[PDB]
């Protein structure tokens, strides 16, 4: 299983300096050897074989070089230690013992499987043991994807190798927003190209005035001409002899994209910063690239250890609820227990929910056939049985309270299209915190891997043979047998948001015009919801329409991947649209969501998992976050098998990136252990004492080996070099997070950042903050592409485990309370004046106002936790930074019942004084009127992209957040964005909300 802690032994976080080790020799002798905690296996083995001669039967012992050590790990695995350079403290031993053996089997494969198992935090061997044929088929069948991706990486070597390691960090469109192009002088970019000149490594700069649309090759050309030159200058040989890099990080310009399409350059133009690039030779980069080789695993050499159609089964649906092993209820507090069941297609029942008879707590036995108001041939391919054991107590009037105790879901047809038959044993799961509904159709399918839980016995119908779902040819068969005011209505429905009410009339209307629908392909989600899924007649017809259906924009396709669209045909169409239109930029932008909808998939093998894994294996920037989003959820037993198997195939084919990921994983495990000591054994210790322990520990060779010289999990283009130990600190707060500082080891760090600063948090769940910051980045992107420079500065946040995460530390930021502490209301403005004296004042007030407008809109829309002088920070240059978002949507509605939309960010006089440049009567100024306009524009820009936000949130319902559990929870965004209103009424609503919150000041121009 996965290790209980990050400790050096079981129930010992850190081994003492010297430790006694039991050494079980191959001649049956046991030797107790005292070892240093940081001693390597090479050392220990030599010291053991020396001591072994002072012991009986030493004549049976071969040479020390013919043996290796094996022991039991914290993962309960017996691991063979082929890498004898490893340190005792780094072994993850359960008890301090080592067994001497002779290395057997496939050495190369055992080593790789240990590397994979380490990255995933689970032993690869556990998968081999699994009885389920779906699992063993997944493990075997996924290798097609692995092979394919590795082949595409050596298709045009070393270029295709470099394109995998260093993918171009580009926007989705070459087209420039007008506010970006206006910052260009005649459409020309002033770029600084640097050269590291041999042998002394000297830096020579060349300022170039090139066109924004210059492909990287053209940028190299002008630098040649500005150095040599035309009088002897016709060298076209440089095209394939030079490549461009960004100074201070591992971002390369390896692809023919207009320079302006590269995010670093596009950002440089917008901020008016000079792009500092680095010219280097193609060879010096191509020589760094190892040849990545995929090996077919040993399990691919092995195999996995009467039939009727569904449509020829002339009977109704019925399930036999036998009994449940037990339930955890107080017999005096509850009256009776029953099994609530339902037949679902996504989150909608296909027929009414059927309950068993009520029985005593002590007697969970029913032996009851439950009848479903559904004809067996009418059961759709994605149909599921959702059930739960519920308790009931009727003590107040005729009113009775119904509470779920345990739930479970199962696919009625399996991955091979076989309908369920015979007796079935299901271990049920605990009810998710905050869920009050008696069923959990959003929840995962299958038995709880924990067997010390309520087990419900079931039994399905046996039709004397194997019932299999009809083939596509058979389905296409059944489908062959069944004006202007309508056209304006169809377009009107297609514009509406994903969660807008659709009346039965509109459903009958959409289904009637199902063939005209093709003219407006974006109505497909609305049409799929009009289909009667419990009718094989309409479904067969829908299957034929989707088969030829025109492709839609990925932002629309992503919806058909949420829990409301479970049909494999619908999902297949969606995956094809992404394969076609989804850019690597957008895949990177919505990766949190795409990984989340993998949990909604009925089966392990599906088109979504293949598409994602393919892209992860052909783009290392995608591969990095793909791994980190899956690894962070590995502690969660509802997905650990699915995510573990997918992580195994990723790690088997990612090549050299596994070594880099394993260094990140080990750096992270050392940090979890360190903070675990501070939270437990050293919890009741002073800062001075804790810091003394922290500096003494970090100074250890094993700690310095592991926490220096690896890539940042926040951005793999960022290198974490030496730890600046004198800048590292445990924070004064109760959580005790870590501020870690690393030198940027890049040759030209000074042109980007000299130090990389990260807050390491162990204890608080950072998934919600990670999502919130991702939503802000998306909002910031929409705004820029609509021409609004509301500088948000969304810093990095990444969840890496169970309440473990990393937050990028923003430099020269101070909370409004810090500023005020070292007062009147002008204190903030004064602080800003002092830090931006002279010419640079206008820009600082400008920056503070735009970032201020961006945050007013974003926090209002999302309904994040109320803002104050401690969760709002400001940079020296004016840039506002919000931290610690907490809850969002309507978290407060359940707690206080007060039904309304809040204004988390109410601008104080302190904030108004800043925007008004020190003026009296701040709301009257042209500064405040410009700020108001910024807000109005920002609000409408997001409202215009409502479908994207509703979709992004919809793709998270099965994540774990209690304010993001149902569709009725996304309803908040529908109120704040006023989607059931007009663009004018919505703007009036946003204005009234600001007015009521600020007590006047918010005006407008009706037409102006």
């Amino acid at each position: 299983p996965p290790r209980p802690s990050s400790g050096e032994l079981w129930g010992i976080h850190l081994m003492p300096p010297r430790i006694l080790v039991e050494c079980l020799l191959p001649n049956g002798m046991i030797v107790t050897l005292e070892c240093l905690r940081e001693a390597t296996l090479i050392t220990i083995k030599h010291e053991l074989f020396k001591e072994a001669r002072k012991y009986p039967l030493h004549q049976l012992l071969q040479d020390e070089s013919s043996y290796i050590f094996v022991s039991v790990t914290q993962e309960a695995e017996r691991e063979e230690f082929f890498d004898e350079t490893r340190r005792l403290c780094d072994l993850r031993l359960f008890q301090p013992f080592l067994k001497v053996i002779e290395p057997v089997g496939n050495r190369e494969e055992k080593i790789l499987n240990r590397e994979i198992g380490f990255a995933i935090g689970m032993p690869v061997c556990e998968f081999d043991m699994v009885k389920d044929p779906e699992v063993q088929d997944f493990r075997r069948n996924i290798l097609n994807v692995c092979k394919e991706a590795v082949d595409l990486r050596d298709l045009n070597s070393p270029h295709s190798r470099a394109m995998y390691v260093y993918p171009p960090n580009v926007e989705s469109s070459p087209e420039l927003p007008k506010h970006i192009y206006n910052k260009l002088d005649k459409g020309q970019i002033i770029v600084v190209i640097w050269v590291i000149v041999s042998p002394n490594n000297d830096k020579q700069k060349y300022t170039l005035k090139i066109n924004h649309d210059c492909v990287p090759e053209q940028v190299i050309a002008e630098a040649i001409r500005k150095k040599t030159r035309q009088l002897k200058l016709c060298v076209l040989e440089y095209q394939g002899k030079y490549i461009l890099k960004v100074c201070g990080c591992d971002e390369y310009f390896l692809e023919k994209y207009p320079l302006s399409q590269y995010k670093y350059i596009r950002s440089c133009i917008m901020l008016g910063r000079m792009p500092n690039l680095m010219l280097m030779a193609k060879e010096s980069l191509y020589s760094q690239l190892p040849m990545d080789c995929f090996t077919m695993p040993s399990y691919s050499r092995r195999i996995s250890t009467s039939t009727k159609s569904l449509w020829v089964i002339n009977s109704a649906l019925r399930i036999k609820i036998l009994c449940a092993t037990y339930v955890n209820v107080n017999i005096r507090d509850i009256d009776k227990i029953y099994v609530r069941t339902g037949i679902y297609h996504g989150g909608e029942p296909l027929c009414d929910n059927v309950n068993t008879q009520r029985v005593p707590c002590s007697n969970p036995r029913w032996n009851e056939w439950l009848n479903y108001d559904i004809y067996i041939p009418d059961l759709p391919r994605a149909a599921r049985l959702c059930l739960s054991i519920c308790s009931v107590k009727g003590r107040k009037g005729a009113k009775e309270e119904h509470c779920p105790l345990a739930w479970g879901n199962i696919n009625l047809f399996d991955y091979t299209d076989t309908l369920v038959s015979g007796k079935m044993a299901l271990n049920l799961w605990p009810v998710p915190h905050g869920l009050e509904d008696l069923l959990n159709p959003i929840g995962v399918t299958g038995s709880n891997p924990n067997k010390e839980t309520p087990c419900l016995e079931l039994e399905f119908d046996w039709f004397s043979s194997v019932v299999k779902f009809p083939d596509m040819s058979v389905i296409e068969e059944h489908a062959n047998w069944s004006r202007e005011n309508d056209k304006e209505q169809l377009k009107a429905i297609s514009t509406r948001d994903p969660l807008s009410e659709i009346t039965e009339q509109e459903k009958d209307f959409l289904w009637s015009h199902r063939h005209y629908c093709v003219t407006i392909p974006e109505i497909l989600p609305k049409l799929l919801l009009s289909v009667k899924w419990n009718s094989r007649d309409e479904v067969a017809q829908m299957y034929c329409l989707v088969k030829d259906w025109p492709p839609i924009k990925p932002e629309q396709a992503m919806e058909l991947l949420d829990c409301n669209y479970p049909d494999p045909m619908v999902r297949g169409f969606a995956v094809r649209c992404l394969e076609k239109y989804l850019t690597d930029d957008k895949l990177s932008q919505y990766l949190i969501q795409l990984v989340q909808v993998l949990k909604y998939e009925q089966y392990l093998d599906n088109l979504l998992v293949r598409f994602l894994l393919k892209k992860a294996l052909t783009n290392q920037r995608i591969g990095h976050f793909f791994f980190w989003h899956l690894k962070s959820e590995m502690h969660n037993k509802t997905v650990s098998q699915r995510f573990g198997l997918l992580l195994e195939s990723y790690c088997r084919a990612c090549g050299m990136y596994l070594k880099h990921l394993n260094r990140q994983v080990e750096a992270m495990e050392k940090l979890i252990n360190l903070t675990d000591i501070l939270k437990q054994e050293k919890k009741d210790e002073t800062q001075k004492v804790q810091m003394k322990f922290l500096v003494e520990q970090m100074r250890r060779p094993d700690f310095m080996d592991a926490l220096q010289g690896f890539l940042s999990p926040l951005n793999p283009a960022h290198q974490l070099g030496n730890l600046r130990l004198e800048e590292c600190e445990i924070m004064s707060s109760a959580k005790r997070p870590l501020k870690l500082n690393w030198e940027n080891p890049d040759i030209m760090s000074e042109l980007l950042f000299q130090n990389n600063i990260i807050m390491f948090k162990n204890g608080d769940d950072l998934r919600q903050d990670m999502l919130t910051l991702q939503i802000i980045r998306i909002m910031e992107n929409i705004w820029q592409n609509q021409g609004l420079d509301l500088r948000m500065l969304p810093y990095g946040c990444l969840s890496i485990g169970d309440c473990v995460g990393l937050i990028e530390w923003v430099r020269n930021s101070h909370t409004i309370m810090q500023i005020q502490c070292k007062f009147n209301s002008h204190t903030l403005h004064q602080w800003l004046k002092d830090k931006n004296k002279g010419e640079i004042y206008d820009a600082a007030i400008d920056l503070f106002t735009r970032s201020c407008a961006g945050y007013c809109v974003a926090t209002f829309i999302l309904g994040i936790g109320d803002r104050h002088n401690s969760n709002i920070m400001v940079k020296d240059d004016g840039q506002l930074v919000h931290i610690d978002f907490g809850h969002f949507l309507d978290h407060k509605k359940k707690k206080f019942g007060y039904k309304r939309e809040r204004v988390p960010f109410v601008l104080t006089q302190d904030f108004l004084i800043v925007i008004s440049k020190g003026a009296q009567e701040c709301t009257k100024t042209r500064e405040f009127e410009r700020f108001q306009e910024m807000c109005y524009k920002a609000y409408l820009a997001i409202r215009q992209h409502a479908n994207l936000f509703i979709n992004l949130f919809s793709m998270m319902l099965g994540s774990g957040m209690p304010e993001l559990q149902s569709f009725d929870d996304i309803a908040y965004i529908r109120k704040t964005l006023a989607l059931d209103k007009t663009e004018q009424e919505a703007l009036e609503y946003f204005m009234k909300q600001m007015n009521d919150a600020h007590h006047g000041g918010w005006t407008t121009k009706m037409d102006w």
């Binding site: 299983p1 996965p2 290790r3 209980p4 802690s5 079981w10 039991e22 079980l24 191959p26 001649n27 049956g28 002798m29 046991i30 009986p56 039967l57 049976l60 039991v72 790990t73 914290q74 993962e75 309960a76 695995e77 017996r78 359960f94 008890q95 013992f97 067994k99 955890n328 209820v329 107080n330 507090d333 339902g342 909608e348 029942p349 296909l350 027929c351 929910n353 108001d373 308790s391 107590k393 107040k396 309270e401 119904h402 509470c403 605990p430 509904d437 009410e501 659709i502 009346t503 039965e504 009339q505 419990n534 359940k894 707690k895 206080f896 019942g897 007060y898 009725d968 309803a971 059931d980």
Partner: protein
């Protein structure tokens, strides 16, 4: 046929408030409300789903043949069986309802704070039990290895015990059995450490069942407390001055 004072007409209430009312209700359960956009939306419970049937007026269907809403609802009253009445069915004034609201809101926060505490214990205990099961599976593997070491020592020493007895080397014979004693006593320490963990896990498994029982006991009492609190709040909202 008042059409405003009607029991199934709820007017200005959202789709979500309707979904809460029609949760787990029987086929035929219904209510009418003002549309989300005058216009009226009828919501009918059919097949475990809530169907939205829009009501049109110009003087539901192509020719609107019904004079008023009550006439349309009563005609169909797949049939409009159970109307959700606006009759929940205590205090006459505002000073009494407020004093009761404050009493319930106080109870609600104490129970909620207790539930949250219980949930942290539930989660901590679940994790600890998982940690112990992995540790027992690790002791199991450790014991196997140590036992295999006895088998190996036995397999080898038998031939040397004869070879030293015929040689009368009593000192070397004692060396081998001192090692075997060291090995067997270690297996005893590992076995008893596994034993102590098995009883620690047995106790903690029981402690989990008790936390689970307590939480299933308060979950419906907390839900009902919130429902009464939200009801007293709505009453106080209604029996007070209302405007923009």
């Amino acid at each position: 046929m008042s059409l405003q004072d009607a029991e199934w007409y709820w007017g200005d209430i959202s789709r979500e408030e309707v979904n809460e009312k029609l949760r787990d209700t029987a086929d035929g359960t219904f209510l009418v409300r003002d549309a989300s956009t005058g216009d009226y939306t009828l919501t009918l419970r059919k097949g475990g789903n809530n169907k939205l049937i829009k009501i049109f007026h110009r003087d539901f269907s192509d020719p609107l043949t019904f004079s008023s809403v009550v006439e349309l609802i009563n005609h169909y009253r797949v049939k409009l069986l159970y109307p959700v009445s606006k009759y929940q069915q205590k205090e006459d004034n505002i000073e009494a309802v407020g004093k009761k609201l404050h009493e319930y809101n106080t109870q609600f926060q104490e129970k909620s704070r207790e539930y949250d505490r219980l949930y942290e214990e539930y989660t901590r205990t679940s994790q600890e039990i998982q940690m112990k099961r992995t540790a027992i599976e690790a002791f199991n593997e450790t014991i196997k290895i140590f036992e295999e070491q006895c088998q190996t020592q036995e397999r080898y020493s038998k031939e040397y015990i004869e070879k030293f007895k015929r040689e009368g080397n009593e000192k070397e014979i004692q060396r081998i059995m001192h090692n075997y004693d060291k090995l067997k006593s270690r297996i005893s320490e590992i076995i008893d450490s596994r034993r102590r963990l098995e009883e620690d896990l047995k106790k903690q498994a029981a402690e989990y069942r008790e936390i689970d029982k307590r939480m299933n006991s308060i979950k419906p009492d907390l839900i009902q407390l919130r429902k009464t609190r939200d009801q007293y709040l709505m009453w106080l909202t209604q029996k007070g001055v209302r405007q923009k």
